[PDB]
Amino acid sequence: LVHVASVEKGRSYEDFQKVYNAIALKLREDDEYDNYIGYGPVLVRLAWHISGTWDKHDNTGGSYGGTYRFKKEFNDPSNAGLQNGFKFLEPIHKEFPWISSGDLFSLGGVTAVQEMQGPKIPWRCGRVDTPEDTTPDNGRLPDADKDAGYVRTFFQRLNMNDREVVALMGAHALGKTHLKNSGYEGPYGAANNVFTNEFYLNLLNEDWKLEKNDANNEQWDSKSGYMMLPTDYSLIQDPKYLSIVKEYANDQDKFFKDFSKAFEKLLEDGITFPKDAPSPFIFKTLEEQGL
Numbered sequence: 001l002v003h004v005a006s007v008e009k010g011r012s013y014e015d016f017q018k019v020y021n022a023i024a025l026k027l028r029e030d031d032e033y034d035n036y037i038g039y040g041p042v043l044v045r046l047a048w049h050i051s052g053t054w055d056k057h058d059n060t061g062g063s064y065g066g067t068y069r070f071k072k073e074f075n076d077p078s079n080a081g082l083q084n085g086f087k088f089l090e091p092i093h094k095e096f097p098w099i100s101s102g103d104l105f106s107l108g109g110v111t112a113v114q115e116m117q118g119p120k121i122p123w124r125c126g127r128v129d130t131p132e133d134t135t136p137d138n139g140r141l142p143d144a145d146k147d148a149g150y151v152r153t154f155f156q157r158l159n160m161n162d163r164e165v166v167a168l169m170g171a172h173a174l175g176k177t178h179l180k181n182s183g184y185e186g187p188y189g190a191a192n193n194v195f196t197n198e199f200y201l202n203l204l205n206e207d208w209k210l211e212k213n214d215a216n217n218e219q220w221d222s223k224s225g226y227m228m229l230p231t232d233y234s235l236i237q238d239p240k241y242l243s244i245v246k247e248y249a250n251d252q253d254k255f256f257k258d259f260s261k262a263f264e265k266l267l268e269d270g271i272t273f274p275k276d277a278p279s280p281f282i283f284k285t286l287e288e289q290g291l
């Protein structure tokens with residue numbers, strides 16, 4: 001299975017900046033979503049979910065084909081709640097119908113991060129929509145009621161090492177859990193929508209209490225009102241993970257650099273970029289364009 005990246009016919013950087021801008025402006029506008037959290041978080045999650053289906057063994061799944069658009073993927077239980085990000089993007093696609101789905105779903109995540117004050121994430125276009133037959137079966141996304149070994153093992157399917165995993169998990173500083181979606185609840189709410197190394201600090205500084213929730217699942221609850229899933233908590237239980245955690249808790253810059261690299265990698269897994277492909281683009285935020 002090879003997936004070669006094919007630039008949307010005749011588009012350039014400028015073309016893509018526009019899609020970005022549209023997503024950005026819309027994020028700014030629809031600030032009421034989820035109790036005023038905005039769509040930032042959910043978009044980040046969607047980008048990760050259409051990408052985390054990848055299997056480095058046979059090259060199946062991954063962001064390339066925009067298969068989330070099909071029923072099977074779309075109705076994946078692990079995807080509960082993503083439907084809101086999709087609906088957010090809909091009108092956007094309608095405006096720029098030439099962009100492929102995989103490119104749009106992924107760009108939304110990049111836009112989200114950057115507009116949430118995260119680091120710049122270089123991005124490459126060229127994902128091509130593939131047929132319904134290429135939709136991976138459900139079951140490839142990770143479970144949350146596990147530990148460090150599970151996490152480690154899981155992520156290896158995606159080619160990510162310890163550092164990548166930890167860097168990537170720091171996205172958990174964002175948004176919140178919704179009982180109806182996953183069987184988890186909180187935080188008690190706050191929720192944040194600014195991208196910082198807060199996840200790490202919370203993990204190291206709070207006094208976590210293990211509790212069972214209304215859905216009968218365990219979660220770590222803090223007095224201050226925060227929450228952490230078992231997989232999240234596991235980062236402090238594993239010796240190797242813990243020191244990285246500590247490192248990020250101490251240096252937001254390091255965190256940002258590493259997150260950027262891992263996120264792009266995650267979004268590019270399984271794709272083959274021809275030699276003549278354009279380099280990755282770094283989009284300007286609204287603010288940088290005075291918009």
Ligand code: HEM
Nearest residue numbers: 041044045048142143144171174175176177178181182231
């Ligand atoms: C072991 C790995 C992971 C597990 C099991 C997992 C699980 C979860 C769960 C259960 C939710 C809450 C769903 C809800 O009820 O709406 C969630 C929230 C979300 N996750 Fe993850 N996640 C992990 C990795 C990721 C990574 C790698 C990212 C992206 C880099 C991500 C970003 C998010 C974001 C931004 C939210 C907040 C969504 C919102 O506010 O609607 N998580 N994650």
Ligand SMILES: [Cl-]
Nearest residue numbers: 045046048049
């Ligand atoms: Cl997630």
